[PDB]
Amino acid sequence: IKVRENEPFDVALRRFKRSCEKAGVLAEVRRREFYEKPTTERKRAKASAVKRHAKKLARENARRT
Amino acid sequence: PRRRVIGQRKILPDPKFGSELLAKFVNILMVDGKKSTAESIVYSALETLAQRSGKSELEAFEVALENVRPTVEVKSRRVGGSTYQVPVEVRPVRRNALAMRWIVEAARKRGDKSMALRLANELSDAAENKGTAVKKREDVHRMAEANKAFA
Amino acid sequence: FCRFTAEGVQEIDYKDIATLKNYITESGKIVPSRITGTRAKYQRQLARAIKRARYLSLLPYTDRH
Amino acid sequence: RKQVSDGVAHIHASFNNTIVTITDRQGNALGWATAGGSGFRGSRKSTPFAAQVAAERCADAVKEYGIKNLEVMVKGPGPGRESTIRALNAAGFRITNITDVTPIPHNGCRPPKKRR
RNA sequence: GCUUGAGUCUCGUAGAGGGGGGUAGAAUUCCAGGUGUAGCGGUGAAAUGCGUAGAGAUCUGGAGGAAUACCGGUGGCGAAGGCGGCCCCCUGGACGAAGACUGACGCUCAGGUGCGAAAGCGUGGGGAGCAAACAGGAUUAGAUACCCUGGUAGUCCACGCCGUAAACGAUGUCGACUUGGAGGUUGUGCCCUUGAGGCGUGGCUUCCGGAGCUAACGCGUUAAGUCGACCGCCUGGGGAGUACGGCCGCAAGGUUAAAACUCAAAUGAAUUGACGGGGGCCCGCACAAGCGGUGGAGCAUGUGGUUUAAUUCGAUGCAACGCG
């Protein structure tokens, strides 16, 4: 949120904004509550995240590369 | 095209003095492959440019070429549902290409007597950016200036 | 991956704000247990401590006060 | 003109427009310029270049105030939020510090349903 | 009579479990004031709307209602619906340790009773934002829709009514047995806490999978497997979960629940193509970048139409029309 880079900056270097959200929560509550889709989109979020992890421990094929 | 990056054919310079840029200029004026008649016009308009300016044949064309040579053009790069233009820098081998093309098409209009009198005046007004040859370079920048917010 | 009172056992206190500042970012937000590696038992207790220190004005809710 | 020393430059970079207002340290505005006031009507209002030219047209009419150093208040996502402050640093000003003043609610009022 | 079923006590553990009462921060809205100037807002674009009565922006002060960013996690609790800022009070349920006690007190359950999302209804308040209805502006051939500007009921509270959901892991409750692995969460025992530990034993839960089952998909120690107890439900599709009558309800409506007639189908899984205003990759004067044309004029030819006694017949989207 706050960044100084006291004397020798000469450039923004403002990665502390994107270090927490800077867009994430403000482009999430500006519309679309549903009281429902946060449950559905989060059930499928970890459902696909664990299959990317399941194939992360099951990629032991030769694949000839 | 789709995949091939071509290598263009070699161009033979003008058979009066070494100038490959002039060899492409007569090709833009070129109608129905009549090279002999087309070379007679790119000559007779060139010394007549020299008597009206006191320069040589090579340097007088380059004076009028810099006023018809653009630097940025607008192309339609589709991002999604909206449709606008995108300004990009002109390639150096492309900079003269539509610059020499604008001189010919502007000399296609405004008929005084004959073609040799047309592009000779077209090179005269483009030497001090007066005629329509530089205006067709001017207005391209207006679409480039009004759409330069797309990058 | 780091560890906390799950090994060096002590009860979570809302008054020792010196240790509580290590588990909040510069914006005052609570750092998740997926970064610090703390157990879920003490993360819930830590969450109450941060909320309690925010109530007693020992830790800021944010930096925009 | 009052010859002020320092000031604060508030930036209201909304989704459709970017409002750049330079105030003093006490919050009293000294001048402003918006992307939609600098021409650019329609789709060209919400672009980082229009936010960039909004700071350039906010670089003048202040200056008579003689501002040398200023703080930047960034609010809203904006199409820019980086070009409008890059032009402010290149306008002849001293960027002391930057903070985010986005009005992020802690689950307050209910968001609308619009834009399906 | 007895103890492995069930139950009670003793000591602890976790939890958004429920009800009542306060309190904190951010944010939105509104009011007043200060600074300050032509746009603000919105969209693919635009306009309705707001603004020179001075808007938008910024600051200060104040008034209100709602909900609790981060923590936050196929994490936890509850029979289900459902429940998350913090604190005070009351209180329910679950689990673990090793003991003590009763002694089959158990399981299920038609009827019956209670709880029961949201919307809605009755009475009294409240109303910030959101938002049916409705208005205006847009799109469209038309748009009483999707878009935008507003905006009432409602969303909030107190007491009742309604008892309806795709109330769904679409899988009733209780009990026993049957390869396993990888995790989460919460107790506990032993060993060295000798070092972000090692070895076991319980409750809940997530994923993958052996046998087995299934029409297949898939389930798979929380089984849709192997067995027992009980209740409810189905007998092709439409009609129809409709009418009639009964019961409940202020109403909306809910529950019970046919028949006539009509059809030889309806349906589920999976398979091969096709299609997608689905995704990923690639190609072709397909696009792009340029040149020269047609469509404007005359003429030649062909076709259709018209006409005629005949204006022979065939081709007549691309792939017929200077064709046979």
Hey, is the C-beta of D43 within 8 angstroms of any chain B C-beta? yes
Using a CB–CB cutoff of 8 Å, tell me whether D105 touches chain A. yes
CA–CA min distance A65, chain D (Å): 43
> Nearest-CA residue of chain C relative to A16?
C26
Contacts of B60 (CB under 8 A, 6+ apart): B46, B49, B50, B53, B123, B127
Tokens of A24: 């994430």
Q: Is A58 on the interface with D (CB under 8 A)?
A: no
Q: Degrees (nearest 5) of the Cα angle C52, C56, C59?
A: 75
> What is the Cα–Cα distance from A30 to A50, expressed in whole angstroms?
30
Q: Which experiment gave this structure?
A: cryo-EM
Cβ–Cβ under 8 Å, residues B111 and B118:
yes
Rg (CA), chain A: 20
Beta strand D29-34 with D18-23 is antiparallel
Quote the tokens at residue C11. 């009860």
The half-sphere exposure of D65 on its side-chain side, counting CA atoms within 13 A, is 22
Helices H / strands E in chain C, number of each: 3, 0
The DSSP secondary-structure symbol of C22 reads G
Tokens 């003109």 — which residue? D1
d(CA A26, CA A14): 18
Phi, psi of B86 (to 5 degrees): -130, 115
Of residues B52, B69, B57, the one with CA closest to residue B121? B52
CA C53 to each of CA C15, C17, C46: distance values in angstroms, whole numbers, following the listed order: 7, 8, 10
Look at D98 and A2 and tell me if their CB atoms are within 8 Å. Answer: yes
Nearest to residue D84, comparing CAs of D7, D1, D18? Answer: D18
- Shortest CA distance from C27: residue in chain A: A1
Residue B34 main-chain phi, psi, to 5 deg: -75, 80
**d(C-alpha C32, C-alpha C35), whole Å:** 6
What is the spatial distance, in angstroms and rounded to an integer, between the CA atom of C28 and the C1' atom of E93?
37
First to last CA, chain B: 24
Nucleotide nearest to D34 (CA to C1'): E39
Whether B29 contacts B100, CB under 8 Å:
no
Beta-carbon contacts of D23 under 8 Å, excluding residues fewer than 6 positions away, are D7, D8, D9, D10, D29, D30
Task: Please judge whether C25 and A2 are an interchain contact, meaning their C-beta atoms are less than 8 angstroms apart.
Answer: no
Q: Is C43 helix (H, G, I), strand (E, B) or coil?
A: helix
Q: How far is CA C29 from the centre of its chain?
A: 9
> This structure's resolution (angstroms)?
2.9
Helix (H) or strand (E) holding A2, with range, is strand A2-3
